[PDB]
Each structure stands twice: as structure tokens, then as C-alpha cells.
């Protein structure tokens, strides 16, 4: 017979599935993996755009020990992308990644709690605010849970509008009960450093953030401004993917991971770390 599996999955093999000895590979017995960022009902945080249809299956709700909801992004069936500042919530600056993992609680889909096997931070997580979350077992991919796909290109070119889902605080600074999203356009890079630092030159940079804290701005991060309705991302939206819809192949790509969520509505730009910069590191981490 031919090996085929159910929806939201693609066959991972070399030659077809007809077999128990296969004339192509022998006795491989292939296992089919999930599907890159193809939501069942795709879309089309202070602001609105209520995620009523479950348009962002990759979004995961990460709650720390002291109950500060943050965000995470499913990148494959077993791993998630978040920010190092999200994992280091309620932890010492010298805390390792071994004791961070038991602290966190993760929710995918509606409220589907998923156990965290291990958490690995970016080696340069002071410059690249990224941490990787590994689940104990691969999550069941369905219309509400589905990994986003890591981009093959750089969709962070200025003017591109990506959808930023979020489980963070809203206009009342209350952690949102329902998942929301905004359509934030990526802004000019020079305007963003100039907005936070002084003059995009190291000898003249100053802590000029309209908000108290300073974002991590470097070559690995881009910036997305507020939407046309002056809505942006607030506390707890960090770790949420800057999901970009590629109309050519109808696939959703995590162009960036929201690093600076403290730009609720005061700072005009939210800082997103480029996934393409971290794509090489995460793929090497999936291997081990």
C-alpha cells in the first residue's frame, strides 16, 4: 500500500509511499511532518483585530512563575521561538537555561498546555534577544495549532506589512483575554535607531527612548511602526512572530520575533529581531 497521513501534514520520504519492502528505499517506513505556516483560516497589543477565527496557530502563550503572560512562536512541530528577556522573567541575570525550563508554562491553541522539555538561549542573547523552547513531545498540528515557517528570504524590506499576533497587554494594560493581532509595517531602519539612540553613529548615540528602557538595536533587528490607527504592541507581546504573508506561494513566514514590547504606544517603533539572522542558529539547534 501507499503511506499517506492526514491533513496539515506532508509526507517526509524519498520515493512515493508504495510498499513490507519499498522498491525505492527499502524499509524506511517514513514519518510525515507538519506543514509550514498554512493556517486553516488565515487573517486579513493595544489595537483591535480580534483573532476570532484562530488565524495565528503559531502563537503560543508563555506565562512565567510570577504570572506575566508573554509570547512564543511555533517554528516547527516541537520547538518554539521566544525572546531571551521572556525566558529570564523572574530569574537572575546569572541564571542558566536548565532551571528556566521548569519555571515556564506554555499554552498553544485555545488553552492546550504543553510541557517544556528544555530551553536553549541564543549564545549572544545580549545582542540577539532569542531563546528556543523545546516541547517534551511534538504538538498535534490542527486548525488551532500549527508552526509558522522560517523565511527563505528577507521580508523585512521597508514598507512590508506583517501581522503581529500577541497575548500581551492591551489599552487598559490588562493581559488580553483573547488573542489579538495588528498589521504593523516595517519602518526605515535609520528612523528607528534615530528614534531610540541618538544619530545611528556609535559616538553620538544617546538613550533617547520615549519609553524608559532601551531596545536591542543592531544588524540582527528590524523595526515595525504602529499601524494606521496608532496601535502597537505592548508588554507581553515579546516573542510573537512578525508573521509576513507571502502572496506568491500563500505561506506565512516569521520574518521577525518581537523583542522590544515596551513600545506600547509611546515609542513609535517596535523592535523585531530578524529570524533570517537567527535561522542558521535555530536549525543547528533543531539538529541536537
Amino acid at each position: 500500500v501507499r503511506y499517506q497521513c492526514k491533513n496539515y501534514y506532508k509526507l517526509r520520504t524519498e520515493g512515493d509511499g508504495v510498499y513490507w519492502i519499498n522498491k525505492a528505499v527499502g524499509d524506511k517506513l517514513p514519518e510525515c511532518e507538519a506543514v509550514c505556516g498554512k493556517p486553516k483560516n488565515p487573517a486579513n497589543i493595544l489595537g483591535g483585530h480580534l483573532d476570532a477565527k484562530g488565524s495565528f496557530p503559531w502563537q503560543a502563550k508563555m506565562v512565567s512563575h510570577h504570572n506575566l503572560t508573554t509570547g512564543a512562536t511555533l517554528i516547527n512541530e516541537q520547538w518554539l521561538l521566544t525572546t531571551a528577556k521572556n525566558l529570564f522573567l523572574n530569574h537572575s541575570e546569572n541564571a542558566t537555561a536548565k532551571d528556566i525550563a521548569p519555571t515556564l508554562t506554555l499554552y498553544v491553541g485555545k488553552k492546550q498546555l504543553v510541557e517544556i522539555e528544555k530551553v536553549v538561549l541564543h549564545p549572544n542573547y545580549s545582542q540577539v534577544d532569542i531563546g528556543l523552547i523545546k516541547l517534551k513531545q511534538k504538538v498535534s498540528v490542527n486548525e488551532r495549532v500549527m508552526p509558522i515557517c522560517l523565511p527563505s528570504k528577507d521580508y523585512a524590506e521597508v514598507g512590508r506589512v506583517g501581522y503581529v499576533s500577541g497575548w500581551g497587554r492591551n489599552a487598559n494594560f490588562k493581559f488580553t483575554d483573547h488573542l489579538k493581532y495588528v498589521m504593523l509595517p516595517v519602518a526605515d531602519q535609520d528612523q528607528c535607531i534615530r528614534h531610540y539612540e541618538g544619530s545611528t553613529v556609535p559616538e553620538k548615540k544617546t538613550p533617547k527612548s520615549p519609553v524608559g528602557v532601551q531596545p536591542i538595536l543592531n544588524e540582527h533587528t528590524f523595526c515595525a511602526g504602529m499601524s494606521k490607527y496608532q496601535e502597537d504592541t505592548c508588554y507581553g507581546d515579546a516573542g510573537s512572530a512578525f508573521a509576513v504573508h507571502d502572496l506568491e506561494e500563500d505561506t506565512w513566514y516569521a520574518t521577525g520575533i518581537l523583542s522590544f514590547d515596551k513600545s506600547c504606544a509611546v515609542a513609535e517603533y517596535g523592535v523585531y529581531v530578524k529570524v533570517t539572522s537567527i535561522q542558521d542558529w535555530v536549525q543547528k539547534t533543531i539538529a541536537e
Binding site: 483591535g48 492591551n170 489599552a171 489579538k180
Partner: protein, 143 residues
């Protein structure tokens, strides 16, 4: 939670002098001005960019009248709010996809409008009573 008879009396007395034809429109216009993302749901109401355009919009005034009438209906049935607002909550959740936090924002804006209209008569006790009222309305109108 049950609302105390003194708080109910204060709410009713303060609502008796509320201009139904104007207070709701004022609250809706203030919501659309302060929180511009709420203008997303009223793209069929015409011009909503300038605050003067928002407040002077006839469609905004009519819809604010309807919203304030719904507030009055929920006030007459403060003890049964989910039952009275089931249909409106279903409408907003499914047909309109209005985020529940928008209801709390509109309740806060309505409280601000009431304070603006009534001056010192909007005492902290009656404001607490009205905060309970608008919280109940928003919770009954959510999820």
C-alpha cells in the same frame, strides 16, 4: 456581584438626568477619538479622521443613541446582565469581531462623559457604582 441598594439608587438618580439623545453619541465619539482603532468598525459611518468630524457625524450620534439605550436596558436589569446582553454579545463576537476590551474602554469613556456632564455630582461613590455597572455590562457583553 450584587449591587447594594444605595449604589443602585445613586446610579438610577444619576441616570435619570442623562440626555439619552446626546450622552451616548458623545461617549461613542470620544471612544472613536481617543482610541482610533475603534474607528475600524465604523468605516461605513463616513468621515472619522478629525475629532470634530467624529463628534459631528450624524451616524455616530445615532449609533451612540442606540448604545446608550442598550446601556439603559442593562441598567434596568442590573441583576440579569448576561441574559439581557446575550444577543448583543453574540453580535459583537461573531458578526462584528469586536474585542471585549473595547467594551471596557467604552465603559470608561462613558464614565468620563458622565463626569464631564455632571461635574462634582459625579462623586467617587457614584463613580464606583458606575464602574461596577460598566464592568458588569462589559463582562456580560464579552466572550
Amino acid at each position: 456581584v450584587h449591587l447594594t441598594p444605595e449604589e443602585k439608587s445613586a446610579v438610577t438618580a444619576l441616570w435619570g438626568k442623562v440626555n439619552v439623545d446626546e450622552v451616548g453619541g458623545e461617549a461613542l465619539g470620544r471612544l472613536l477619538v481617543v482610541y482610533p482603532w475603534t474607528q475600524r468598525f465604523f468605516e461605513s459611518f463616513g468621515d472619522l479622521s478629525t475629532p470634530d468630524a467624529v463628534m459631528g457625524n450624524p451616524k455616530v450620534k445615532a449609533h451612540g443613541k442606540k448604545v446608550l439605550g442598550a446601556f439603559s436596558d442593562g441598567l434596568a436589569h442590573l441583576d440579569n446582565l448576561k441574559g439581557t446582553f446575550a444577543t448583543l454579545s453574540e453580535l459583537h463576537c461573531d458578526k462584528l469581531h469586536v474585542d471585549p476590551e473595547n467594551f471596557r474602554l467604552l465603559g470608561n469613556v462613558l464614565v468620563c462623559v458622565l463626569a464631564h456632564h455632571f461635574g462634582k455630582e459625579f462623586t467617587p461613590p457614584v463613580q464606583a457604582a458606575y464602574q461596577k455597572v460598566v464592568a458588569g455590562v462589559a463582562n456580560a457583553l464579552a466572550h
